[PDB]
Design an enzyme around this catalytic site. Sequence first.
Site, PDB file in Angstrom:
ATOM      1  N   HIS A 187      10.721   0.123  19.978  1.00 37.46           N
ATOM      2  CA  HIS A 187      10.996  -0.999  21.047  1.00 37.46           C
ATOM      3  C   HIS A 187      10.599  -1.726  21.254  1.00 37.46           C
ATOM      4  O   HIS A 187       9.974  -0.635  22.517  1.00 37.46           O
ATOM      5  CB  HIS A 187      12.497  -0.493  21.775  1.00 37.46           C
ATOM      6  CG  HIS A 187      13.527  -2.195  22.382  1.00 37.46           C
ATOM      7  ND1 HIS A 187      13.574  -2.750  22.239  1.00 37.46           N
ATOM      8  CD2 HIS A 187      13.771  -1.581  24.130  1.00 37.46           C
ATOM      9  CE1 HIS A 187      14.028  -4.278  23.219  1.00 37.46           C
ATOM     10  NE2 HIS A 187      14.136  -2.894  23.894  1.00 37.46           N
ATOM     11  N   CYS A 189      10.838  -7.787  17.717  1.00 39.95           N
ATOM     12  CA  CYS A 189      11.069  -7.483  18.934  1.00 39.95           C
ATOM     13  C   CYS A 189       9.253  -7.197  19.725  1.00 39.95           C
ATOM     14  O   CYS A 189       8.909  -8.633  20.622  1.00 39.95           O
ATOM     15  CB  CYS A 189      11.173  -5.786  18.917  1.00 39.95           C
ATOM     16  SG  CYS A 189      12.574  -5.062  18.589  1.00 39.95           S
ATOM     17  N   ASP A 246      13.528  -7.858  28.295  1.00 39.68           N
ATOM     18  CA  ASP A 246      14.008  -7.350  26.929  1.00 39.68           C
ATOM     19  C   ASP A 246      14.591  -7.898  25.692  1.00 39.68           C
ATOM     20  O   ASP A 246      15.517  -8.507  26.270  1.00 39.68           O
ATOM     21  CB  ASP A 246      14.520  -5.835  27.080  1.00 39.68           C
ATOM     22  CG  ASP A 246      14.603  -5.203  26.099  1.00 39.68           C
ATOM     23  OD1 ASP A 246      14.994  -5.610  25.012  1.00 39.68           O
ATOM     24  OD2 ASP A 246      15.072  -3.851  26.115  1.00 39.68           O
TER      25      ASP A 246
END
Length: 219
Positions: A112, A178, A129
């Site tokens: 992540h 990501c 995020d």
Amino acid sequence: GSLVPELNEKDDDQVQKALASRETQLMNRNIEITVRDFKTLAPRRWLNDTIIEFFMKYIEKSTPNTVAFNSFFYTNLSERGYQGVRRWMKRKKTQIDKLDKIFTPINLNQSHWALGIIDLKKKTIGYVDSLSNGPNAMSFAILTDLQKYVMEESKHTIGEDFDLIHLDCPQQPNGYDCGIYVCMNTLYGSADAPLDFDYKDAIRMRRFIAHLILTDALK
């Protein structure tokens, strides 16, 4: 307008070439990028540390009064505290009191990718995020560390009163983009632009970074 350009036909083909190429050096400026690294820009793939590092340095060079640390910054700060990163700013040939922002790409649990943004003028520290479930223990920790970092680096002149926030951003439609989204957020953040991009803008980022690598953008 738009921050991530569309490549012209010659530039997009040069990328295609390099992606289908079997080649140990696409770039060396202190970031060595190989086709192996380059291929992480290829579609549906997990962007690696080297490509983040590249983009970060690109942003640095393309943004006044801005520092964009590589992903190893936060790892060292987290595991070793300020003392583990105490020269990193000096190496940037600047001082923290002379900056508008500081970007910190964050690799959580080795997969992540997320973003920390220290805005010295706005007096905020944001956690951004693209696969956010909301506030959590790790995000809290990130904000706490980044603040600690500001407080130390500045010899305790600034940072103690900063707003520690969770910044909404566009959410990715899949579980692999990501890296790209971090890059997207960094670019936008650097332009003081609202985080109002879409997934199509994000896919263009892949080609753009690729272009930037192939054109020796850091030079």
